[PDB]
Design a protein around this ligand. Structure first.
Ligand SMILES: CC(=O)N[C@@H]1[C@@H](O[C@@H]2O[C@H](CO)[C@H](O)[C@H](O)[C@H]2O)[C@H](O[C@@H]2O[C@@H](C)[C@@H](O)[C@@H](O)[C@@H]2O)[C@@H](CO)O[C@H]1O
Ligand SMILES: CC(=O)N[C@@H]1[C@@H](O[C@@H]2O[C@H](CO)[C@H](O)[C@H](O)[C@H]2O)[C@H](O[C@@H]2O[C@@H](C)[C@@H](O)[C@@H](O)[C@@H]2O)[C@@H](CO)O[C@H]1O
Ligand code: NA
Ligand code: NA
Lengths: 456, 456
């Protein structure tokens, strides 16, 4: 096991810009919304696509109020109907009566995303149930690549290209062997800042669709994980990144951080029968604390109705999720403790200076690295937040948190494994004088760019 | 030919940062210096490595004076002797009398480069005439990855990893092949910002070691060039990227810009007999004008002597080189021209603000994109300098430049094909009132971040 190797695997600059987005939105919309399905059958009549009240500004307003950093639109789902006027097939909005055949929903969405300060990403299903070339090999690749080129060069900066693994062809279906390597070269060449996700090397599907977050989430994982979703370790395993899980891989490991994806409803597309099963503001806020406080990026889907609007319950939950995240952020930014450290005290101000590029790192011979955060007055708290300077790698393996009570006893307030981008370690309301964070397990010396004790 | 794909192939942000360096130094130094050889045989006595006056600060001052942005050290050449105390072999400085076995020349160079404002890069020869694992396959990959690991984690940020492709049979009669893809994973994981050069995807050997520069240099080229150093295309071919040369490749092309490498002496390592064969300031400045005015990076090797200093003639030529370059940059930044454009006047000021991140692009239906630069007084000029916003791709195919003389007549000054990072287009001295740059061939609308008219 070479810890100078493991402890120094680092995010690319596109991975690090992505990680700081934290939470962004999925928008599953199109033919499936019109036909009320989760998967379409292919060859749907384009006359079915006639939403009478498409209001992307209403979607974006609600995503801004929800604290979203960007939006990923389903520009072509498995059914093959394209939401832009592709020159490569007639199975698009141009063949539909929406906007008299002059519409381009990718343009409307990306333009409105930008006006509202949200990044824009594209979902482009490799699986296609309409396209005649699908199953033919190379001729389908050329079609796909030609569609990537349209999406990546006509609509401005793309932050994510999301490549779904789903394939329902079955034992007797069409067999298409995607030329993934040729697709990557296209994406890298045209949008080199974009992250290629799921069936791609930059961002890893966390391995469930229900919003479950691992107890420990390693961004440093075996390199074969980048092929997991493509065609025996699996995106689903609970343990991917522990010393024990990675040792036999040696250098054949990489930075490949997790994205937790889930829908606000049981389905990805809008179904009216799901209006009473829309996740609430607090269930969403809990998901957020859990994911964004658990080294996991959060991709939350909110499907527009066939009228072409986000439904009321969904807008209410998003408004409420954004109020909560925004009070959290406000709390973190305005708390004020004095920080003391077990060693390298000259750098203790880095833990509390509001600067994500400065960090504290204990001397290499410090046998028990610890941070103590002393509150200006005795205070009721119920979380600590801690961040690693993940530019420099992911190190922390165990963290134990203790609290000094005003009577002068101390309680073990809670423990966690991995930190990474951010750990929000939650516990019961408790009034304390100070907290100590015992970083008692690490892969070489940890680099900690923020620490705070907070009341959520 | 798909122009919508070609005109939109772009550099990664790491290739973009490397391009802004322009010129940086090679330092070939080590066992071969001590035995006065261009190639070592392997198994050299480590007592031979005993330079008496290693003074890397003296190297770095001379390189700063020469205008270099960085330096790339041969941390191990083909002979196999390591300039740092590697844990994977005893064929290193730890076995030599240099600093009584306690030296690390890699540490000395990288720390001095950093003090001097210079980036640091490493050359680590895959070919190894000493290492006993060479020729055994995976076991030599293990070794090599192990040494790459030391170099990429122990010495701060690395701007380039420069990989030469040569191979040989080992002491077992068998040829070593290299697990390239495995090496790239190491480099990408530990130093995400580094460019992997020559035998690597990010930076292309220009195809000669004589300082020759193509008339037209395309950074958009067939993707197979990335394997050329690992009729077929060669790195040496004159035409790699014209519409004719790339047409057949469709999207299997990429951003792979040229690096022109050459030595300030006939050999790469120092030889006392070559002290009277050091290229002069003027030769080196014509080389700079040619490469850095021809969309090529310049990598200039200056080898330290067996006593451990850059020799006087080398220092002197560096000094004069740096002076001419600095006069060039003065002429570039002190001309006060008014810029007018054939379309999109609102963006004209982007031509002259000295900012590489703003550019002018003519209207979609401007049929004759042109820039006229008006001098404050009739002035003698003998070059134009033009730079494309290469962040967005490389598009210019032909440029024609005319001059307006004070007597109201017009002269055709010169023409050039490619531009890329920068074209310096020189021509017979002439006094003009203004000059016009007619971009009369381009892959879609050109994007130009600087245009100037100068006296060199
Ligand atoms: C194991 C599993 O969840 N399988 C099917 C889903 O596909 C996986 O989806 C995830 C993303 O959650 C990832 O791409 C894997 O590579 C796929 O195998 C499937 O969901 C698909 O992804 C959704 C985001 C959505 O676009 C959906 O329409 C798409 O088919 C779901 C469909 O409900 O079925 C799973 O059984
Ligand atoms: C085609 C050629 O020049 N081959 C031999 C050189 O190798 C090429 O070096 C260039 C860089 O100029 C590039 O890596 C190619 O892929 C190599 O094939 C060879 O030079 C090697 O490169 C120098 C930078 C230097 O480090 C040298 O020691 C090393 O051998 C030279 C040796 O002089 O011979 C060529 O015939
Ligand atoms: Na900080
Ligand atoms: Na500019």
């Amino acid at each position: 096991i070479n810890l100078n190797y493991l402890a120094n695997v680092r995010p690319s600059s596109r991975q690090l810009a992505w990680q700081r987005m934290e939470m962004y939105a999925f928008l599953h919309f199109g033919m499936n919304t019109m036909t009320d399905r989760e998967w379409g059958l292919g060859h749907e009549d384009p006359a079915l696509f006639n939403p009478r009240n498409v209001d992307v500004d209403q979607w974006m307003d609600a995503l801004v109020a929800g604290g979203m950093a960007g939006v990923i639109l389903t520009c072509k789902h498995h059914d093959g109907f394209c939401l832009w006027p592709s020159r490569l097939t007639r199975h698009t909005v141009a063949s539909s009566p929406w906007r008299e055949g002059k519409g381009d929903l990718v343009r409307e969405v990306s333009e409105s995303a930008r006006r509202h300060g949200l990044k824009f990403g594209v979902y482009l299903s490799p699986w296609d149930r309409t396209e005649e070339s699908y199953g033919k090999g190379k001729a389908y690749d050329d079609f796909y690549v030609g569609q990537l080129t349209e999406l990546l060069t006509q609509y401005g900066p793309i932050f994510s290209v999301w490549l779904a693994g789903a394939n329902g062809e079955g034992k007797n279906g069409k067999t298409q062997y995607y030329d993934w390597d040729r697709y990557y070269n296209v994406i890298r060449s045209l949008q080199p800042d974009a992250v290629i996700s799921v069936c791609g090397p930059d961002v890893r599907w966390a391995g469930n669709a229900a919003g479950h977050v691992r107890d420990n989430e390693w961004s440093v994982v075996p390199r074969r994980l980048r092929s997991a979703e493509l065609t025996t370790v699996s995106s689903q395993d609970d343990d991917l990144g522990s010393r024990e899980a990675v040792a036999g891989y040696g250098d054949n490991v990489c930075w490949y951080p997790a994205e937790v994806d889930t829908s606000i409803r049981p389905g990805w597309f809008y179904h009216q029968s799901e209006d009473d099963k829309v996740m609430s503001a607090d269930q969403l806020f809990d998901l957020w604390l859990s994911a964004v406080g658990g080294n996991s990026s959060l991709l939350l889907n909110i499907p527009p109705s066939p009228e072409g609007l986000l439904a009321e319950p969904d807008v209410q939950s998003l408004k409420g999720l954004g109020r909560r995240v925004s009070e959290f952020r406000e709390a973190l930014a305005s708390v004020r403790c004095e920080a003391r450290t077990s060693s390298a005290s000259a750098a203790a101000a880095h833990l509390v200076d509001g600067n994500r590029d400065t960090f504290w790192r204990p001397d290499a011979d410090d046998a028990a690295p610890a941070i103590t955060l002393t509150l200006p007055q005795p205070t009721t708290i119920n979380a600590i937040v801690i961040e690693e300077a993940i530019e420099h790698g992911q190190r922390i393996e165990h963290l134990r948190v203790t609290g000094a009570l005003p009577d002068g006893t101390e309680r073990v307030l809670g423990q966690a494994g991995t930190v990474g981008y951010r750990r929000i370690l939650r516990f019961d309301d408790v009034e304390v004088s100070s907290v100590t964070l015992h970083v008692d397990g690490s892969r070489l010396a940890p680099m900690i760019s923020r620490a705070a004790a907070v009341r959520i």
